[PDB]
Symmetry: D2
Subunit: 115 residues, 4 copies
């Protein structure tokens, strides 16, 4: 699949399991249209969000529901979610891995783009 997300928990030193995420794609009217969603597995990875055919060029937003993740663990974090907004496939099809590293008051995201 051309879009995968992996999430780590910097407090536990573990993959962040059951992190919900919603992907949106900017529509012609400049609105965010729902594109795909899912939750991380026990490996902290979310595979199978989309297909090469459906993952056309556009501007995508991956909302990672970090507040819902920390609150499900009984922790009150700072951010509502982590957002990753990027243009995809504008030079032809690519594979995107979006990594995220979570702490209650800090996070880091990184993209690995392969052809």
């Amino acid at each position: 699949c051309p879009l995968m997300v992996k999430v780590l928990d910097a407090v536990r030193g573990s993959p962040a399991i059951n992190v919900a995420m919603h992907v949106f794609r900017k529509a012609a009217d400049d609105t965010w249209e729902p594109f795909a969603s899912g939750k991380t597995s026990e490996s902290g990875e979310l595979h199978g969000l989309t297909t090469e055919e459906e993952f056309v060029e556009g501007i995508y937003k991956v909302e990672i529901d970090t507040k819902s993740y920390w609150k499900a663990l009984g922790i009150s974090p700072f951010h509502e979610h982590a957002e990753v907004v990027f243009t995809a496939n504008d030079s032809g099809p690519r594979r995107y891995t979006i990594a995220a590293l979570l702490s209650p008051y800090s996070y880091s995201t990184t993209a690995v783009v392969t052809n």
Copy 2:
């Protein structure tokens, strides 16, 4: 001055100067209302966005125009913009410092909340 934003450049090891950003507050209808904006100084900091009486509890979004920063340096980056979305909370400390560390394909944000 209850809200400050500081932006650093991880490629050059410098403050990120002249970085534009807009702050929004979430309205009752779930839309983002413009709240404040500015661009970072020679120290990479943006002061004076708001005041204590105006900065009431609620959900805020800081949208940092990282793509324009990198393009002005002749570098093509991954993200359209860096986003920091959070709830302001009176039960906690009263000063919010949002820091963002920028790289072309990665960005980490941290919140430092002090009294």
Copy 3:
């Protein structure tokens, strides 16, 4: 293998390939004894550094040769290397993945510890 290292390049949005690293283990005399070494593959990963039998309890240092990596790409970075120093296996055998994210003037390391 119970110790793996993965390295990403935040400038290119790519696995950091051919990053050399040297692992040391603290000896009884408080010196750092050479334990294992290798370089990242095209996936940015270094597998096979050690075995369950040889990876005994102790204090280990993973030196990641980030300067040698950036200089081989014609970039002058800030750090000499990235160091990761940790006690391993003190509660019994574990598997350790050490992740590192590199920029010329900044890096981040993260440990995933599994049983």
Copy 4:
């Protein structure tokens, strides 16, 4: 004041206060000679480590005692200490700010070099 160190706590969203650190300078025999030390203030900063005339070009190591910080909070961390190893260079800017962001199983350091 050519060298300052700032330490932040990513779990609590605060300066990391009372964090001890030692700075070493690499000697001609490749050993680490003690150079300066101190502990972070209520702002998470350590000022006054050295002076311009003493801080000559060479390789320096800042060893930050992160393990003691986390244990004082009742948290068991991964790393023995955070290490920042770098060459001071006169050709570049003259002020060095080393920042470290701490989480139990992860830590990111950045250098901000300004004039």
